[PDB]
Scaffold this active site. Structure first.
Site, PDB file in Angstrom:
ATOM      1  N   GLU A 177      -0.412   4.616   3.833  1.00  0.00           N
ATOM      2  CA  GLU A 177       0.642   3.885   3.129  1.00  0.00           C
ATOM      3  C   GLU A 177       1.816   4.746   2.667  1.00  0.00           C
ATOM      4  O   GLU A 177       1.796   5.308   1.575  1.00  0.00           O
ATOM      5  CB  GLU A 177       0.048   3.140   1.931  1.00  0.00           C
ATOM      6  CG  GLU A 177       1.074   2.385   1.093  1.00  0.00           C
ATOM      7  CD  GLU A 177       1.919   1.431   1.912  1.00  0.00           C
ATOM      8  OE1 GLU A 177       1.385   0.817   2.859  1.00  0.00           O
ATOM      9  OE2 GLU A 177       3.125   1.303   1.613  1.00  0.00           O
ATOM     10  N   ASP A 178       2.830   4.841   3.520  1.00  0.00           N
ATOM     11  CA  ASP A 178       4.079   5.509   3.177  1.00  0.00           C
ATOM     12  C   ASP A 178       3.883   6.906   2.604  1.00  0.00           C
ATOM     13  O   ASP A 178       4.478   7.250   1.585  1.00  0.00           O
ATOM     14  CB  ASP A 178       4.872   4.662   2.179  1.00  0.00           C
ATOM     15  CG  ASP A 178       5.423   3.396   2.797  1.00  0.00           C
ATOM     16  OD1 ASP A 178       5.623   3.373   4.028  1.00  0.00           O
ATOM     17  OD2 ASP A 178       5.661   2.423   2.051  1.00  0.00           O
ATOM     18  N   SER A 179       3.016   7.696   3.230  1.00  0.00           N
ATOM     19  CA  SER A 179       2.956   9.111   2.901  1.00  0.00           C
ATOM     20  C   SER A 179       2.586   9.950   4.120  1.00  0.00           C
ATOM     21  O   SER A 179       2.355   9.418   5.206  1.00  0.00           O
ATOM     22  CB  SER A 179       1.954   9.353   1.771  1.00  0.00           C
ATOM     23  OG  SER A 179       0.684   8.815   2.085  1.00  0.00           O
ATOM     24  N   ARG A 195       5.571  -1.648  11.393  1.00  0.00           N
ATOM     25  CA  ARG A 195       7.019  -1.652  11.270  1.00  0.00           C
ATOM     26  C   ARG A 195       7.691  -1.734  12.639  1.00  0.00           C
ATOM     27  O   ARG A 195       8.888  -1.987  12.719  1.00  0.00           O
ATOM     28  CB  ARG A 195       7.511  -0.436  10.489  1.00  0.00           C
ATOM     29  CG  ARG A 195       6.962  -0.383   9.073  1.00  0.00           C
ATOM     30  CD  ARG A 195       7.492   0.813   8.316  1.00  0.00           C
ATOM     31  NE  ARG A 195       6.872   0.939   7.001  1.00  0.00           N
ATOM     32  CZ  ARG A 195       7.487   1.426   5.930  1.00  0.00           C
ATOM     33  NH1 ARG A 195       8.739   1.860   6.022  1.00  0.00           N
ATOM     34  NH2 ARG A 195       6.876   1.431   4.755  1.00  0.00           N
TER      35      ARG A 195
END
Ligand SMILES: [Mg+2]
Ligand SMILES: [Mg+2]
Ligand SMILES: [Zn+2]
Ligand SMILES: [Zn+2]
Ligand SMILES: [Zn+2]
Ligand SMILES: [Zn+2]
Ligand SMILES: [Zn+2]
Lengths: 538, 67, 49, 117, 275, 46, 50, 49, 576
Positions: free
Chosen positions: A155-157, A339
């Site tokens: 998650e976004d890291s 995405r």
């Protein structure tokens, strides 16, 4: 084509764009004119008659990329990427840290972030030259491997190489410039820059003026911290009302010496003194601080995939290639397909082959280059798997990983999101006696906000006592005495002897109640409106 | 800017091979031949040098580099 | 400001080549905030007389 | 920094000890040892060294956390054979092999003062 | 223990900058761990104390100081002889645990002057300094052996500083790592099938693959075991690669012996008895 | 303390302990610079 | 209770009462007892027709 | 005398507009700092369209 | 204005009572830590240095408590202040003899915050009861909060740069109060929709799918390695799944080890594989694809999310019921640890190869589009002839626009279905989609084949350019591109025109999101202010603040919604 040669002649001699305008081979066009013109997409294909559904074309685009803005122009093949990600990049690009001009030394802005070793994009759009981006890059093309690893990149890291941090990975300077002015404070009252001693001045609470010079200013190059007095000045006030002996060396010398906010630590960068249109004597000082990448700090890809540093590991712990190549970054695979950011892969694939080629590839979305197979065929030529996927060895067991890895270089952003500036906490400290509420915030060491919805959840929680601790004990605690004759809060209360409720002649039937102090104030406010609210257990 | 020694990906030194490269460019307009001569057989090292850029000279361009 | 409700933001087609569609803040001002195209230009005003 | 210095990864405090020894309270002839300021790198060869021993009923290890610098080892051997001897045997065997590896390396490097051809 | 590997060793190729060799009869865990030893474990000397006396150059001291770290000091003088400054119980530092360095430059010339490692001198007893025409009274320099250009100076710029080199190792910081990327290979044919390699034609052949060279797209053996690890050590220049390996091999043994001593100490300190 | 900053444009130290109105010899400009600190300062090479 | 101004304790008449702006606390070092009260800190409040 | 008008950077009246980069660095000015925004009380100010 | 001061407009009510600041609280950015137990929260040392607890002295720990006083502020395991029975407090930083300082039972000591302490954690914005949970601290380096992945799930937190807030109670009632209620393990099932709130996701979910594969085989050495990863284990090694030609263990055997040993969850494989039934019944060749576990032992079946949680028929819900929150939390932490470690060694990636399909099918797909392109022209010409028949109750244009839409949908679906076929099961993407992670077939269509038609409110792109969309198009053009149809793939790229139509729709999602984000906060406020007036009573009857009865009993049964479950009554059986 000869006119192009004229454009070439312009580099030495002359052939102005205006002459090209004067040439009338191109014209400048508004939207009203566009409604009537028959615009062409491309010179080549549209001139064909074999499939000429129309040939009444009147004008043609210079290049479809001209629609693009400053930010969109940066990311290659935006059309292979999901459209909003580009808007997110356009915003986040603005959020990135980086260089901005040439003469940083003369510049003394309140805040700045500059990278030690910036890099021009391995894959670039030609227009970025006109954007002078290669002159002023704002990131580096790091070589990344796409793998979930231990989920610390979820998650976004991303997981990053600590040993790379040791080499100077994305390390940056932070410059803050402080400014301070001297000025009148009345007909006679005024600030006075100086280095006052603890006994020759008051309002010093506890801080010392050791760092100061006799001028009252700290020396350049001095090590600083978030507590000491940065600028020394004091203002005497009454000059005569003090009179007669309550003299002291502090006299009326009230402190107004500037000190640093309780957070920053660092070294003094620069000190400059001058005067302004106001005429008052003022000084400006620049303070240097160093920003190094840390766990949790926000970072971003050129393809709008931002992420924080989930953790950092030594190079040995990292899984490695046939050579033993540890990637600079470990990104979670799954973040891309949701995405749908295929373009992110193209930077890597173009970057990989360009690096092997030792030559830069163009990042224009529209080409005939056939970037898919030809590059892949070419990637095979340098002696690699044609799709870019490669096997890597374990960082701990050394064993070859079951899956094969897509690895290669990518332009990355260091985002303006100092996490250590985002943190905030307190357990006890300065309050706001006017309402008994905690201080406004971190720059005044305040408490943290409590919102209506946390209350709403807390009711839904049913834990009334925790809310009570939080609303009363953790914010606004008070004790009140009431007359037994009347719920009206009236006491004089000798807080060592008597209590009494005047107007009721109470002498003993006093009672004590626990309510918020801010609440008591509201109640007093009702009384000022001639309301006499009262309250009892009966 | 100011070529960092040791390729971040590996550690290959290049503390003087920038100017040499620039020398190689002036001597030979073949980056491949330049890149090869420097000994950067690895493209991670090549990316290091290929994507390097040195604005300092423009910084040096100023005269007021006295105080 | 003037003229509100049932008007919103989305996009107009003539904006093609006039403004970058991606170049907008992700805040509430999204679409409400626009940005100049790469090669767009603005009329300065002249006298037709 | 809100994080410890780098030497703290391996350097022990004066109150710390490198390894801690505990008997298992669950199965006979078993024990669980805790090693401080150490990683799987050591752990894996020793597990393997114990696995190489057929007298071992059980052997295993883990850090309590990767960020943390500590490991725990659980070992069970035949009731006649103590787990302590297995760890002692495994280390002495391993150290001995390393010395010969070094000596053959010395022989291998020494075996070309000039050239092999 | 009844049986152990014979750790077959074979050295393929060696230079002052790299060493290529093949190790056989050994565990994969040993190969990776010793590999991890090659980087982090090797003790080295590096600068830990820097004072900048004067700097009228454009760069800020901390930039240079980080760079001073980035300097590749050769370690060919048994740098292990120096005691650790922490253990040397000396007032912060001493020549028994530190080397001293000093740099002073001033650009009086009108043209841009360049600053190099040579401007930095070891004030402490000449333990082998930075690799800049000190090792190479040898007609085999790279081009000048000016290894590192410290900075450039236009007319009027000055730099005065002092430095202390101290003892440390790669695990502490990469600047103390005497090695670049370490090459490693076992079982190129993938007989162990550690990964699928779908359509092996999509996978170019490794140089070691060339041995059993094969056009059968990847032979297979389920009973196989990791063997014939291929090595190529890439030294950063700080030391000769094979010599780095010996120091690495010595250090790991020493690292283990201390744990055995502690292991004896665990059983000594314990109430347990063994004999 | 002989220190006092240095003018910016004449690029010269004024050098005194004075409450003068930030003036400067020959160079009328008010822009002042302050000397580097006269203190022991340790730097690491990390 | 008029004897405040800055120095008193139940065990001794206070000699010094330092103001710790950082924690926003009032400390009396020579014995060890917060004299209580941090009024909102003056060091926090040191940034502040006819 | 009627007033002092604040001028846009790189204006025709911004006499630096003719100076070379070398001149600008001689002025300690950034050659890639075209301006186009006012400086008010030493602060940089840009008009939003 | 005296009324105004009170009135609420930043007044005593809204500006003070409805929202204020509190102490003993911290907020930072969030970071992930699957290694953390579901109750753990990672906590910065500086915060821990900042945070303290005032404990009342007891003779059982007074000596230790005195050590904290003696240790003082100068280190973390010490104490900052002591508060005497009579009320006196002491700063140990300026105390002349902190170690020699006297202390007794009944005094309070402000010691630093320590690990194992229970805190309350919250999202901001706060939307439900799981949005605020009691947590166990973990003191760590760097100013980051580290959390278990699955705790992100009820929180919906993102490490893109979200901050969340934590509060530390200072009373033992509240510590119990947080421990008995606010703690996360009880929060597992939602009463709102009688379902579990926990959910194992992404990497963990994908490797689990990978782990259920039939081709999964283990070695004894790795089994010991896997066993140590276990948060709990019987201490008794299991029998090999295979003995000859060589001893082996299966991943299903080992997954079943993770499973508690006397509970089962049956059939909901919920994966595409097999045959929307009827086929898998052919003949009860009933294994692999469909999920079945017995006595804590998995017989067959690739796992899904509907199995894994936040849904009816999930293993998670029944474990909560049987094993309870405490056993289920330890199982859950354990599995995540194991799957993570296996994933770490197994590994997973993604590349352009995953975007590769068969050329011939890819060739067939474009030609399928070509026929559809031709199919549109047939529809256009008939309308231009006015020979086209309008749909009953609709205009000819409504028919025409509808008719072109079915074609653009049928073709894209057909060409999509070709891509679903064209992909190997070897693919990470198919692996990611099947596992129940963030993907689907439509994605494949968009990435590999075709994005499809862009629309405005569901309608084809309007003629904003004077009976046209762009000057590149001819007047009276009706091509699907002329109306926003994106024929290309994310792999194929987009035309300048398609990108613009693609950019426009991205706005529609984004604008709607921003507007939706502001409004939900407001609507809720309207909702809460109403519903706050009602609570359950001890007589089972539902009543308000003025004690009036709403219901004879809550939900007409008085029972907990969490204890409710989806069931078939089947008494409405067809034939009597
Ligand atoms: Mg989120
Ligand atoms: Mg998320
Ligand atoms: Zn009364
Ligand atoms: Zn390299
Ligand atoms: Zn010493
Ligand atoms: Zn001057
Ligand atoms: Zn006292």
């Amino acid at each position: 084509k000869r006119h192009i040669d004229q454009l070439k002649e312009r580099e030495y001699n002359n052939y102005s764009w205006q002459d090209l305008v004067a040439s009338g081979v191109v014209e400048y066009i508004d939207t009203l004119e566009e409604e009537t013109v028959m615009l062409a997409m491309t010179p080549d294909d549209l001139q064909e008659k074999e499939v000429a559904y129309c040939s009444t074309y009147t004008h043609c685009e210079i290049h479809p990329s001209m629609i693009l803005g400053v930010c969109a122009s940066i990311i290659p093949f935006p059309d292979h990427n999901q459209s909003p990600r580009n808007t997110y990049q356009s915003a986040m690009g603005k959020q990135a840290m980086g260089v901005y001009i040439t003469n940083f030394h003369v510049r003394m802005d309140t805040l700045a972030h500059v990278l030690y070793y910036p890099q021009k994009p391995l894959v670039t759009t030609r227009s970025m030259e006109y954007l002078r981006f290669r002159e002023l890059p704002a990131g580096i093309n790091s070589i990344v491997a796409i793998a979930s690893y231990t989920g610390y990149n979820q998650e976004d890291s991303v997981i990053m190489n600590r040993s790379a941090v040791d080499r100077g990975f994305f390390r940056s300077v932070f410059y803050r410039s402080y400014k301070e002015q001297e000025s009148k404070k009345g007909f006679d009252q005024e600030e006075v820059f100086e280095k006052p001693t603890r006994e020759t001045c008051q309002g010093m609470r506890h801080a010392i003026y050791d760092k100061l010079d006799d001028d009252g200013l700290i020396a350049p190059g001095v090590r600083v911290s978030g507590d000491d007095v940065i600028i020394g000045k004091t203002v005497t006030l009454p000059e005569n009302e003090d009179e007669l002996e309550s003299t002291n060396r502090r006299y009326t010398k009230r402190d107004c010496s500037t000190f640093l906010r309780t957070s920053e630590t660092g070294i003094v960068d620069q000190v400059m003194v001058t005067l302004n249109q106001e005429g008052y004597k003022f000084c400006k000082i620049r303070v240097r601080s160093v920003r190094i990448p840390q766990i949790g700090d926000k970072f971003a890809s050129r393809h709008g995939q931002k992420g924080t540093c989930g953790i950092q590991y030594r190079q040995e712990d990292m899984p490695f290639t046939c050579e033993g190549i540890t990637p600079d970054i470990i990104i979670n695979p799954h973040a891309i397909p949701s995405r749908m950011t295929i373009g992110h892969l193209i930077e890597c694939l173009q970057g990989k082959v360009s690096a092997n080629k030792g030559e830069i590839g163009d990042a224009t979305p529209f080409n005939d280059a056939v970037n898919v197979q030809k590059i892949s065929n070419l990637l095979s030529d340098y002696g690699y798997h044609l799709r870019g996927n490669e096997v890597l060895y374990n960082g701990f067991t050394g064993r070859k990983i079951t899956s094969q890895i897509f690895i290669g270089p990518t332009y990355y952003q260091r985002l303006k999101h100092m996490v250590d500036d985002k943190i905030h906490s307190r357990a006890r400290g300065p309050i706001q006696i006017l309402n008994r509420q905690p201080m406004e915030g971190r720059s005044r060491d305040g408490g943290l906000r409590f919102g209506e919805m946390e209350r709403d959840c807390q009711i839904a929680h049913g834990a009334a006592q925790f809310l009570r601790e939080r609303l009363f004990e953790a914010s606004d605690p008070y004790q009140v005495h009431v007359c037994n004759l009347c719920g009206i809060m009236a006491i004089a209360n000798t807080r060592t002897h008597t209590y009494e409720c005047r107007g009721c002649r109470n002498k003993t039937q006093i009672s004590l109640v626990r309510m918020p102090y801010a609440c008591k104030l509201l109640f007093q406010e009702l009384m000022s409106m001639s309301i006499a609210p009262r309250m009892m257990s009966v | 800017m100011i070529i960092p020694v040791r390729c971040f990906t590996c550690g290959k030194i290049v503390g003087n091979k920038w100017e040499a490269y620039l020398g190689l460019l002036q001597a030979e307009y073949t980056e491949g031949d330049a890149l090869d001569a420097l000994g950067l057989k690895r493209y991670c090292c090549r990316r290091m040098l290929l994507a390097h850029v040195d604005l300092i000279e423009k910084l040096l361009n100023y005269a007021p580099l006295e105080k | 400001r003037d003229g509100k409700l049932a008007k919103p933001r989305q996009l107009h087609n003539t904006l093609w080549g006039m403004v970058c569609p991606a170049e907008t803040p992700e805040g509430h001002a999204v679409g409400l905030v626009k940005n100049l195209a790469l090669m767009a230009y603005i009329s300065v005003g002249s006298q037709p007389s | 920094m809100n994080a410890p210095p780098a030497f703290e990864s391996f350097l022990l405090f004066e109150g710390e000890k490198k390894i801690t020894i505990n008997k298992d309270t669950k199965v006979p002839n078993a024990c669980l040892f805790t090693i401080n300021k150490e990683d799987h790198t050591l752990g894996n060869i020793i597990k393997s060294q114990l696995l190489k021993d057929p007298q071992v009923l059980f052997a295993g290890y883990k850090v309590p956390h990767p960020l943390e610098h500590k490991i725990i080892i659980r070992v069970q051997t035949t009731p006649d054979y103590s787990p302590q001897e297995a760890f002692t045997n495994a280390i002495t065997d391993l150290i001995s092999e390393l010395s010969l590896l070094e000596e053959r390396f010395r022989v291998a490097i020494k075996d070309k003062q000039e050239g092999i051809e | 223990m009844p049986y152990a590997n014979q750790p077959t060793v074979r050295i393929t190729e060696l230079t002052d900058e790299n060493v290529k060799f093949i190790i056989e009869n050994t565990d994969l865990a040993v190969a990776n761990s010793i590999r991890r030893v090659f980087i982090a474990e090797v003790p080295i000397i590096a600068i830990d104390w820097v004072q900048i006396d004067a700097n009228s150059s454009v760069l800020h001291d901390e930039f240079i100081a980080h760079r001073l770290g980035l300097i590749p000091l050769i370690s060919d003088d048994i740098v292990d002889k120096l005691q650790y400054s922490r253990d040397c119980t000396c007032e912060e530092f001493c020549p028994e645990c530190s080397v001293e360095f000093t740099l002073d430059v001033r650009c009086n010339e009108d043209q841009t002057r360049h600053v190099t490692s040579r401007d930095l001198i070891s004030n402490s007893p000449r333990v082998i300094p930075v690799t800049s025409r000190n090792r190479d009274n040898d007609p085999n320099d790279y081009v000048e052996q000016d290894d590192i250009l410290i900075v450039k100076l236009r007319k009027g710029q000055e730099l005065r500083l002092r430095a202390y080199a101290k003892k440390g190792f790669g695990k502490e910081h990469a600047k103390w790592n005497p090695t670049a990327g370490v090459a490693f290979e076992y079982d190129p044919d993938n007989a162990l099938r550690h990964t699928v390699y779908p359509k092996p034609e999509e996978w170019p052949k490794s140089e070691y693959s060339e041995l059993d060279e094969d056009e059968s797209q990847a032979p297979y053996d389920p009973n196989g075991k990791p063997e014939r690890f291929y090595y190529n050590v890439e030294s950063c220049g700080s030391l000769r690669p094979e010599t780095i390996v010996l120091s690495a091999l010595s250090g790991l043994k020493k690292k283990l012996s201390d744990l055995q001593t502690q292991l004896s100490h665990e059983i000594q300190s314990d109430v347990l008895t063994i004999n | 303390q002989p220190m006092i900053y240095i003018c910016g444009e004449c690029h010269t130290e004024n050098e005194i302990k004075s409450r003068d109105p930030i003036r400067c010899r020959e160079c009328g400009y008010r822009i002042m610079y302050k000397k580097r600190t006269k203190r022991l300062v340790v730097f690491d090479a990390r | 209770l008029d004897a405040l101004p800055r120095v008193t304790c139940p065990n001794h008449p206070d000699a010094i009462l330092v103001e710790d702006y950082r924690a926003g606390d009032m400390i009396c070092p020579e014995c060890g007892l917060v004299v209580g009260d941090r009024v909102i800190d003056v060091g926090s409040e040191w940034r502040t027709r006819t | 005398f009627i007033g002092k008008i604040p001028i846009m950077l790189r204006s025709t009246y911004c006499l630096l507009n003719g100076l070379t980069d070398r001149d600008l660095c001689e002025l300690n000015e950034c050659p890639l700092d075209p301006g186009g925004y006012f400086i008010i009380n030493g602060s940089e100010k840009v008009l939003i369209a | 204005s005296l009324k105004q001061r009170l009135k609420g407009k930043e007044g005593r009510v809204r500006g003070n009572l409805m929202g204020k600041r509190v102490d003993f609280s911290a907020r930072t950015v969030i970071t992930p830590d699957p290694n953390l137990s579901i109750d753990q929260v990672g906590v910065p040392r500086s915060i821990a240095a900042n945070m303290t607890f005032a404990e009342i002295v007891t003779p059982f720990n007074i000596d230790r408590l005195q050590e904290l006083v003696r240790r003082g502020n100068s280190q973390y395991p010490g104490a900052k202040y002591i508060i005497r029975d009579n009320g006196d407090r002491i700063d140990l930083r300026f105390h002349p003899k902190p170690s020699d300082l006297h202390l007794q039972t009944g005094y309070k000591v402000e010691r630093h915050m320590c690990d194992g302490d229970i805190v309350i954690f919250n999202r901001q914005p706060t939307l439900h009861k799981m949005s605020m949970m009691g947590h166990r601290v973990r003191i760590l380096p760097w100013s980051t909060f580290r959390l278990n992945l699955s705790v992100t799930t009820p929180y919906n937190a993102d490490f893109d740069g979200d901050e969340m807030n934590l509060h530390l109670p200072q009373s033992l009632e509240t510590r119990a109060e947080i421990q008995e209620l606010a703690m996360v393990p009880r929060m597992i099932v939602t009463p709102q929709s009688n379902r579990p709130v926990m959910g194992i996701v992404q990497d963990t979910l994908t490797a689990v799918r990978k782990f259920t594969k039939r081709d999964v085989f283990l070695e004894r050495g790795e089994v010991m390695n896997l066993l140590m990863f276990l948060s709990t284990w019987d201490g008794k090694v299991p029998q090999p799944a295979i003995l000859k030609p060589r001893p082996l263990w299966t991943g299903k055997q080992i997954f079943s080890l993770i499973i508690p040993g006397h509970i089962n969850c049956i059939r909901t494989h919920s994966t595409h594989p097999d045959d929307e039934d009827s086929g898998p019944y052919k003949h009860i060749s009933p294994g692999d694809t469909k999920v079945v576990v017995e006595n804590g032992e998995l017989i067959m079946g690739i796992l899904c999310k509907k199995s894994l949680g936040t849904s009816a028929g999930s293993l998670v819900h029944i474990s909560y019921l049987e094993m309870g929150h405490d056993i289920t939390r330890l199982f859950y932490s354990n599995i995540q640890t194991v799957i993570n470690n296996w994933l770490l060694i197994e590994g997973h990636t993604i590349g352009i190869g995953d975007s590769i399909a068969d050329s011939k099918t890819y060739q067939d797909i474009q030609n399928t589009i070509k026929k559809a392109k031709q199919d549109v022209i047939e529809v256009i010409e008939k309308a231009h002839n006015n020979e086209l028949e309008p749909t009953p109750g609709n205009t000819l244009r409504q028919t025409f626009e509808n008719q072109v839409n079915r074609i653009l949908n049928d073709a894209r679906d057909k060409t999509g279905s070709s891509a679903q076929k064209s992909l190997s099961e070897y693919n990470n993407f198919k692996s990611m989609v099947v596992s129940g992670a963030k993907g689907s077939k439509i994605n494949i269509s968009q990435v590999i084949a075709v994005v499809g038609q862009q629309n405005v409110e569901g309608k084809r792109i309007p003629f904003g350019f004077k009976h046209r969309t762009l000057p590149h198009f001819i007047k009276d053009d009706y091509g699907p591109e002329s109306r926003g149809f994106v024929e290309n793939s994310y792999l194929a790229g987009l035309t300048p025109t398609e990108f613009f139509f693609h950019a426009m729709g991205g706005r529609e999602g984004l604008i709607d999101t921003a507007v939706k984000t502001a409004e939900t906060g407001y609507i809720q406020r309207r909702l809460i202010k109403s519903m706050e007036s009602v609570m359950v009573k001890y007589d089972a009857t539902v009543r308000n603040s003025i004690n009036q009865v709403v219901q004879l009993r809550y939900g007409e049964d008085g029972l907990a919604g969490e204890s409710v479950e989806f069931q078939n009554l089947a008494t409405l059986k067809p034939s009597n």
